[PDB]
């Protein structure tokens, strides 16, 4: 939601020219992080290993005002409430897992493996 | 190198007519022959020095007035003039054509590893064969310097330096070539493993 956001030096950490400090938004995300941590202690989840793995913010139903404008025009002035969503998770150890290989039978195929190995010299 | 046939064909731009060479090269790039063209200052274009000078001057008149940096690049170098001639003959607006341009390398005054390489002739491109007797012709490097090519002076020194390394290698090559033919000839008759294959070939080598 880039424009007409001017520019801040301090977003060069994130490699992007355009930064803002939007204080009210940051406070509400803070509250809900602390709620989730409080919930985490109740479940007996490890405090150190909490990483945020999901935040999803979606738009809530607008509250309606209307301001009254030049030449008897009325045009809406609307507030934007949010649906904020957060999920915290514990840091997991590297999960691998394994799959098959349903390969070869045949005419040149039996003769592939078996000749190439058996009566074939394998140079180092 | 590795190709359908040779991935590098080093082509001598000497005594080639500019559009004749450009068109045959354009075909070769589309075919996947990946060619390098060297000595584009030695490249010739028919029509008197003066006639070419005025033709080439007509484009710089062409200039995108609003921002001329969107506007037509009037490529001074003989290598880049060759490059423009090939590029126009190729559909360079397509991604196929981009591949084909990348297959092409263009150098004025044969550098790096290309000098111990043989500069192949394209005989259709040859000016001496195709062009009629007593017809005056222009040399592209002369034309280049008029339209503002800085490096006419520069390449001439670099070419002379190259020619000198190319002279000493030639001299030793010719000396070596004598001594290789005697070393075949003297062992040849002296048993028969050279008499067997040469005279059973017996063609004319």
């Amino acid at each position: 939601f880039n424009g007409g956001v001017g520019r801040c030096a301090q977003a060069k950490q994130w490699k992007t020219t355009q930064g803002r400090w939007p204080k009210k938004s940051a406070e509400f995300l803070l509250q809900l992080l602390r709620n989730a941590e409080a919930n985490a202690d109740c479940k007996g989840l490890d405090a150190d290993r909490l990483v945020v793995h999901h935040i999803q913010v979606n738009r809530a139903q607008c509250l309606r005002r209307r301001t009254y404008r030049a030449h008897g025009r009325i045009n809406p002035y609307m507030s934007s409430p949010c649906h904020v969503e957060v999920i915290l998770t514990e840091k997991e150890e590297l999960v691998s897992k394994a799959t098959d290989d349903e390969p070869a039978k045949k005419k040149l195929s039996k003769k592939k493996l078996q000749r190439q190995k058996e009566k074939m010299l394998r140079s180092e | 190198m590795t190709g359908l046939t040779n991935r590098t064909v080093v082509i001598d731009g000497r005594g080639h007519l500019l559009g004749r060479l450009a068109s045959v090269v354009a075909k070769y790039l589309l075919q996947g022959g990946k060619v390098a063209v060297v000595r584009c200052e030695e490249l010739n274009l028919s029509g008197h020095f003066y006639r070419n000078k005025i033709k080439f001057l007509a484009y710089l008149r062409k200039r995108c007035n609003v921002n001329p940096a969107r506007g037509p690049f009037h490529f001074r170098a003989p290598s880049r003039i060759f490059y423009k001639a090939v590029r126009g003959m190729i559909p360079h607006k397509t991604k196929r054509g981009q591949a084909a341009l990348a297959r092409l390398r263009v150098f004025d005054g044969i550098p790096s590893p290309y000098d111990k390489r043989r500069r192949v002739v394209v005989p259709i491109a040859m000016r001496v064969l195709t062009l009629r007797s007593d017809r005056k012709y222009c040399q592209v490097g002369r034309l280049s310097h008029e339209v503002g090519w800085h490096y006419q002076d520069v390449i001439k020194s670099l070419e002379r330096k190259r020619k000198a390394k190319l002279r000493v290698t030639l001299k030793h090559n010719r000396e070596l070539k004598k001594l290789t033919v005697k070393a075949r000839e003297n062992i040849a008759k002296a048993a028969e493993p050279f008499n067997k294959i040469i005279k059973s070939y017996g063609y004319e080598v």
Binding site: - | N65, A77, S79, P111, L158
Partner: protein, 364 residues
């Protein structure tokens, strides 16, 4: 199609556009007086700093001017030119694409303000540039690195330039950021150019060697940057008469329905100032000796003429405004030089031999 009807002179020359803010304060020469074999093995240029402007008086000679035997009072510039330290040598080969540097070779000891350039955060920096390159000098020398690099430069390199470095500490400008330039050695013989450079490592070269009183010099600076400004100030378009609805200081007419096209050539609001510019044929009044001190404490007679006798120095009462202790070797230049207060300007040898008899006057 109405004409201009009165044919007018196009406000603002197209040959300084497109007016974008300057990248490098260390002015990049576009041009050097070749290397005409025979002559000195001296640096074409020096980096100086503006100390400002003094005002001066001299008798003017030129045959047949009627400025003859009458004094003329002339605007002045005063540039702080403290002896540049040669710290390196670069040699360039002409290739058909352009001049390519092969080699930069460095003085064993690079002295802090010469290192400061390489760093934008000095107090967090470990200062470890150039530890390992100075360690070339510990080992074997030119049999593994240093003279092998220099030899390569002798072998081909058609043009040799010397990396020369400002003593900013001598100027009480709070910068500390001494400024790097490459300066072409005009010197007859390529081989001699490198050799004088090897010798010149960690050695200072004074202003006096390259330059002489009443020599023609070019002064090359970035200009005064002065904001986003109005169309009227920038391109020198005539201010629309006061009857103008909603904003008198524009350019009225971009142009013409056909072509459907804003031309560049139309006076627009965009950067007026911060531009590299070379102005050429600025004469030397004086090369001023900063000198100093045996037991009798000099800085005496820097503002001195044979006619004044009155000691002191070029320093105006209350040290030059914004700049100003000005303790040093100076080049006093004939009066208006490109570049603001506290700025880097490179002083240069004139490209060509001025028969323009106002200089060759030896003025006193």
């Amino acid at each position: 199609m109405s004409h201009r009807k009165f044919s007018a002179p196009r406000h603002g020359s197209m040959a300084f556009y497109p007016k974008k803010r300057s990248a490098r304060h260390r002015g990049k020469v576009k041009a050097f007086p070749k290397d005409d074999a025979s002559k000195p093995v001296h640096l074409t240029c020096f980096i100086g700093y503006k100390a400002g402007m003094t005002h001066i008086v001299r008798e003017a000679d030129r045959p047949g001017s009627k400025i003859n035997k009458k004094e003329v009072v002339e605007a002045v510039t005063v540039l702080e030119t403290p002896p540049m330290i040669v710290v390196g040598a670069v040699g360039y080969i002409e290739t058909p694409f352009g001049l390519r540097a092969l080699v930069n070779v460095w003085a064993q000891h690079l002295s802090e303000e010469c290192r400061r350039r390489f760093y934008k955060n000095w107090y967090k920096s470990k200062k470890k540039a150039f530890t390992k390159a100075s360690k070339k000098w510990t080992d074997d020398l030119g049999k593994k690195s240093i003279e092998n690099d220099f030899r390569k430069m002798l072998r081909y390199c058609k043009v040799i330039r010397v990396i020369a470095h400002s003593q900013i500490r001598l100027i009480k400008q709070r910068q500390k950021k001494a400024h790097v330039m490459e300066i072409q050695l005009n010197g007859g013989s390529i081989e001699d150019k490198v050799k004088w450079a090897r010798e010149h490592l960690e050695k200072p070269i004074q202003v006096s060697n390259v330059f002489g009183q009443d020599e023609m010099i070019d002064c090359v600076g970035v200009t005064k940057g002065k904001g986003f400004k109005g169309v009227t100030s920038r391109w020198h378009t005539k201010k629309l008469p006061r009857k103008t609805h909603k904003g008198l200081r524009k350019v009225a007419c971009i142009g013409a329905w056909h072509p459907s096209r804003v031309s560049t050539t139309v006076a627009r609001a965009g950067q007026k100032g911060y531009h590299h510019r070379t102005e050429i044929n600025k004469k030397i009044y004086r090369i001023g000796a900063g000198i100093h001190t045996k037991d009798g404490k000099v800085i005496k007679n820097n503002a001195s003429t044979e006619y004044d006798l009155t000691d002191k120095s070029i320093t105006p009462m209350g040290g030059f405004p914004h700049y100003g202790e000005v303790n040093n070797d100076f080049v006093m230049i004939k009066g208006c030089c490109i570049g603001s207060k506290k700025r880097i300007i490179t002083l240069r040898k004139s490209l060509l031999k001025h028969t323009k008899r106002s200089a060759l006057e030896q003025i006193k």
